[PDB]
Design a protein around this ligand. Sequence first.
Ligand SMILES: *[C@@H]1O[C@H](CO)[C@@H](O)[C@H](O)[C@H]1NC(C)=O
Ligand SMILES: *[C@@H]1O[C@H](CO)[C@@H](O)[C@H](O)[C@H]1NC(C)=O
Ligand SMILES: *[C@@H]1O[C@H](CO)[C@@H](O)[C@H](O)[C@H]1NC(C)=O
Ligand SMILES: [Cl-]
Ligand SMILES: [Zn+2]
Length: 597
Amino acid sequence: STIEEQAKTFLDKFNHEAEDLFYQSSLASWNYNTNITEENVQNMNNAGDKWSAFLKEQSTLAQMYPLQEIQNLTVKLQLQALQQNGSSVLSEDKSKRLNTILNTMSTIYSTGKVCNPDNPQECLLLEPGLNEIMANSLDYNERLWAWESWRSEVGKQLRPLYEEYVVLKNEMARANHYEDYGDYWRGDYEVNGVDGYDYSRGQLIEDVEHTFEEIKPLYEHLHAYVRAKLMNAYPSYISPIGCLPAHLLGDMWGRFWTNLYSLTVPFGQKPNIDVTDAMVDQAWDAQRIFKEAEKFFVSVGLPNMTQGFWENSMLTDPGNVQKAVCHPTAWDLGKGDFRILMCTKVTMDDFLTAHHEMGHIQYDMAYAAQPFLLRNGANEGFHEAVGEIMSLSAATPKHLKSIGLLSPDFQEDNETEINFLLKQALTIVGTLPFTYMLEKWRWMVFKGEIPKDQWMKKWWEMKREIVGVVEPVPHDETYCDPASLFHVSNDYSFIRYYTRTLYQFQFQEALCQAAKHEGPLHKCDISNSTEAGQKLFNMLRLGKSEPWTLALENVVGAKNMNVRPLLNYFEPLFTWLKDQNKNSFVGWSTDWSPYAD
Ligand SMILES: *[C@@H]1O[C@H](CO)[C@@H](O)[C@H](O)[C@H]1NC(C)=O
Ligand SMILES: *[C@@H]1O[C@H](CO)[C@@H](O)[C@H](O)[C@H]1NC(C)=O
Ligand SMILES: *[C@@H]1O[C@H](CO)[C@@H](O)[C@H](O)[C@H]1NC(C)=O
Ligand SMILES: [Cl-]
Ligand SMILES: [Zn+2]
């Protein structure tokens, strides 16, 4: 037999065995997240360990088939996914140490606490507490206390662990035939053996940097505008030409500027659209929320939710004696079983989350026919882009009207528009520079371009230059500020938030053009457009069977990540911003710091 037709038989055996073990493991996890019990956690952990052990025997059994001796690119993909050693490429004593380090960093992050200087017995965890403060406090000193203490007490515990961690990780990566751990992560965008859609790992770094350059003007103006607003909020604490102090941005790191809305809102008098009241007066409930979301998809040519989705889904919190995790989540348990777990509340926010989450299900259903290993988004950043796209259309004033949740009496002004776009930009645009800079620092650390003795130095040099943000206190190499962020100490790649953001607007611009939308992109609603739903579905059913470059193309007509659509979305705010900054200093000096004097 040929090491192709036997690989095909190996794969066929895997899919049937895998589909069944993944289903048992999924069902077990679903029981525990819907009915937190002691035996339900038992059933789950065991069903999960049976799946991991299967995946390992199957991986170290697929090696047998020479990747080069393979032709059918579709079988190469599957085979590729499977024969990935990863950490198992390490010697038992190493793997053991790496796992200990990961668990340790993880626990000090979720369990570390800081205590009040004037009361050693009043101690706060990051969540909630420090988070509550960083999001709501308007006191410069209290915010500074929380920012520095988090990094001083827990971040420093992470420093030692993080260094050993990159060593061990780069080792895993090299032995797996990659340059370094960061090169390993970029491996998610790599596509080969396909003329015209190939994509290099290093090519990710340059498309990110090239697209980032085009975003800079919008960011600088957003930066100059909020920097002037924060000056009124913190009189005499900030320079007209300086970086924004790190502890004044709305969350513990400045990942999103979302919480800077009350201090930066362009027209505080105009009412912020919020139907979370009109839903109540109409006696709306969880069922109606998801039924309306379901109706939204069918309106563009997608299928109804499945029978069973409605029966097996936990769309409401069971209350007391039925403890469950309420984080909204979309499940693809296998064998055509789809479910959404969410403790739905009658709010505008949950009406949008339902669309986002039902967006994921739709994506899961569209590619259910692909073999097991190809059932996922084209790349790490597609699923959330698809989910975010749904809320965009559902929140538009035009959508809320046609649905009867917003009366045709709510006039939209050029001011309610800028108010909305600014709010959007604080989350969406504010996070792009933060995200790119954080991953850049890690990429460089993994490559070895930043000596342990210059980690923090380079970190803050980069915060000041790229993000235009400065540390309130100086930090030596004793600190590990990037690790005080969940994704860093919890070992998750971060660039996906950058790419997903650019993808979502490419998708949205594409679907809206296919929907014959007329005005500004941010007012678009794709409802009723089967032409939009068809274009969306052409890439959705692909799963990961095609290069992501092709799945993108099937939707936007181009094979690469492009920032123009994001910019088009924000153009109205961008022109307003420029005029607002007519007399302001746009940009920043990297010399200034809160302590320079
Ligand atoms: C790869 O194999 C599958 C089934 O094993 C077959 O249906 C498919 O056409 C092959 N891909 C191509 C077109 O080479
Ligand atoms: C995984 O490790 C095994 C043995 O250590 C090796 O034979 C195999 O080539 C590795 N997988 C690949 C192709 O990276
Ligand atoms: C979607 O189609 C229905 C069917 O006529 C229509 O009533 C509804 O208003 C459409 N959605 C919008 C707002 O375009
Ligand atoms: Cl930081
Ligand atoms: Zn999501």
